[PDB]
Design an enzyme around this catalytic site. Structure first.
Site, PDB file in Angstrom:
ATOM      1  N   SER A  50       0.734  -1.101   0.058  1.00  0.00           N
ATOM      2  CA  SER A  50       0.129   0.125   0.069  1.00  0.00           C
ATOM      3  C   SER A  50       0.736   1.343  -0.020  1.00  0.00           C
ATOM      4  O   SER A  50       0.382   2.327  -0.178  1.00  0.00           O
ATOM      5  CB  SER A  50      -0.958   0.086   0.916  1.00  0.00           C
ATOM      6  N   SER A  97      -6.046   3.120   4.020  1.00  0.00           N
ATOM      7  CA  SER A  97      -5.465   2.102   2.929  1.00  0.00           C
ATOM      8  C   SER A  97      -6.630   1.365   2.177  1.00  0.00           C
ATOM      9  O   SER A  97      -6.270   0.138   1.945  1.00  0.00           O
ATOM     10  CB  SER A  97      -4.675   1.109   3.691  1.00  0.00           C
ATOM     11  N   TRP A 190       1.074  -3.231   4.083  1.00  0.00           N
ATOM     12  CA  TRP A 190       0.872  -4.441   4.728  1.00  0.00           C
ATOM     13  C   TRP A 190       0.515  -5.623   3.576  1.00  0.00           C
ATOM     14  O   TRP A 190      -0.453  -5.656   3.137  1.00  0.00           O
ATOM     15  CB  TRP A 190      -0.099  -4.453   5.743  1.00  0.00           C
ATOM     16  N   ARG A 230       3.695  -1.533  13.528  1.00  0.00           N
ATOM     17  CA  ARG A 230       4.648  -0.613  12.739  1.00  0.00           C
ATOM     18  C   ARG A 230       4.741   0.862  13.265  1.00  0.00           C
ATOM     19  O   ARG A 230       6.016   1.339  13.340  1.00  0.00           O
ATOM     20  CB  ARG A 230       3.834  -0.541  11.309  1.00  0.00           C
TER      21      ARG A 230
END
Ligand SMILES: *C(=O)[C@@H]([C@@H]1NC(C(=O)O)=C(S[C@@H]2CN[C@H](CNS(N)(=O)=O)C2)[C@@H]1C)[C@@H](C)O
Length: 244
Positions: A50, A97, A190, A230
């Site tokens: 993404s 996303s 991801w 993350r």
């Protein structure tokens, strides 16, 4: 004050404690620093996943395939995540996303124009293959964490080859946090269509004084992990380095 041995050890421990393998690359001015618990990841190629949304948005806007207020309607089909079952602008799709929106945008741009634009900006290995709507998800397009931090550095400084207004419009879409006068602009990634899976967080910090410090975190996601690791590793690292 704090030794770089201790900085390196602290940041490694963030990856160790998340029980993953990863790297975070930080750029200060021209100097690139690699931290984490798997430093050799720094020049290895992974799908952008993404993170490609940033360049997808630049390309679509520059070539008038969308505007920043345009509402991309949900088609009414079931989506992987209930949060994606709604109408949204590029900006909202960026925060969430929402791949169906970036897939529609890619289809508008189209394969021929997409390839030529990915070449012109020299993104990763620059190869998009024959499938316009999943080339950033499952190959052939790949990019190293060093190349991602350099892309973020470019965008943060309005150096990509797009109108200044195009770059400002995309940057506005990427504000994810404010911490004591600092602003964090980043795009998460991801990639679940590859094995092993890849986690990304690529952006920059804009400090109070106007300085921009780009970074790219890259790590191995496994089934089970929360995506917010993350972010948590990134903020801990930036804070440890006194960047925020
Ligand atoms: C692109 O990489 C992929 C997106 N990317 C993400 C992402 O979080 O980076 C998702 S996961 C989906 C959207 N955000 C929710 C999770 N929030 S969090 N903080 O990460 O736990 C659910 C999705 C896989 C495209 C190609 O689908």
């Amino acid at each position: 004050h704090i030794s770089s041995q201790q900085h390196e050890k602290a940041i490694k421990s963030y990856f160790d404690e998340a029980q993953t393998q990863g790297v975070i690359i930080i750029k200060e001015g021209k100097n690139l620093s690699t931290y984490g618990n798997a430093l050799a990841r720094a020049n290895k190629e992974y799908v952008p996943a993404s993170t490609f949304d940033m360049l997808n948005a630049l390309i679509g806007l520059e070539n008038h395939k969308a505007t920043t207020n345009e509402i991309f309607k949900w088609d009414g089909k079931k989506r992987t995540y209930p949060m994606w079952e709604k109408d949204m602008t590029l900006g909202e799709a960026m925060a969430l996303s929402a791949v169906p929106v970036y897939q529609e945008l890619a289809r508008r741009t189209g394969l021929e124009l997409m390839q030529k634009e990915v070449k012109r900006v020299n993104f990763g290995n620059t190869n998009i293959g024959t499938q316009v709507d999943n080339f950033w998800l499952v190959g052939p397009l790949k990019i190293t964490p060093v190349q991602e931090v350099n892309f973020a550095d470019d965008l943060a400084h309005n150096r990509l080859p797009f109108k200044l207004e195009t770059q400002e419009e995309v940057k506005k879409m990427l504000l994810i946090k404010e911490v004591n006068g600092s602003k964090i602009y980043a795009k998460s990634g991801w990639g679940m269509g590859v094995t092993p899976q890849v986690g990304w967080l690529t952006g920059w910090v804009e400090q109070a004084n106007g300085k921009k410090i780009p970074f790219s975190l890259n790590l191995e996601m496994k089934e089970g992990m929360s995506g917010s690791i993350r972010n948590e590793i990134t903020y801990k690292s930036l804070e440890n380095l006194g960047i925020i």
